[PDB]
């Protein structure tokens, strides 16, 4: 299985499936196996990774879909990351 590494601004290294990370067109362009994100801290990038898992799991499923949870305190920074990453 092919993995890639996404590094937060505070140095946390998140290792995820390549297919998952290609959810983002921005990340695709940054790869073409490690990407550094100077403006995305770990409390945000961890949640981004969780979204990839959620999206891949629930896209094209008839099994009932749960809400993606986002705490108030991270919502603004997460919005900014989602806009940069186009996801």
């Amino acid at each position: 299985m092919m993995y890639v590494k996404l590094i937060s601004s505070d140095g946390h290294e998140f290792i995820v499936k390549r297919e998952h990370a290609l959810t983002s067109g921005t990340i695709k362009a940054m790869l073409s196996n490690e990407v550094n994100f100077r403006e995305i801290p770990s409390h945000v990038l961890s949640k981004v990774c969780m979204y990839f898992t959620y999206k891949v799991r629930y896209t094209n499923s008839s099994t009932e879909i749960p809400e993606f949870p986002i705490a108030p305190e991270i919502a603004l920074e997460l919005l900014m990351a989602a806009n940069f990453l186009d996801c």
Partner: protein, 104 residues
Amino acid sequence: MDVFLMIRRHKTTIFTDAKESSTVFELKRIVEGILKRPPDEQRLYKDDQLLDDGKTLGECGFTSQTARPQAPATVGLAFRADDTFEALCIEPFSSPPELPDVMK
């Protein structure tokens, strides 16, 4: 049934899934393919508890309805340097700032 995990050590975090019926040892083989350290140089934990190789992930409390895609469960990881094992150390994620006034 699939379970969705974060395998964490120091400032490393692996996102992956596994079967509820799969073993602790089989999870070390997954970590081996990614971080290039063999099973006998790994210890896996649930909170502070050392996990036994032959047990299933389900037996150790990782179930499909508690280890979810959008909220995965954490497995601690420690490596052996030379003769002995390091202590379990998981670096916390950064802290969110204060809510802006307009969001209160």
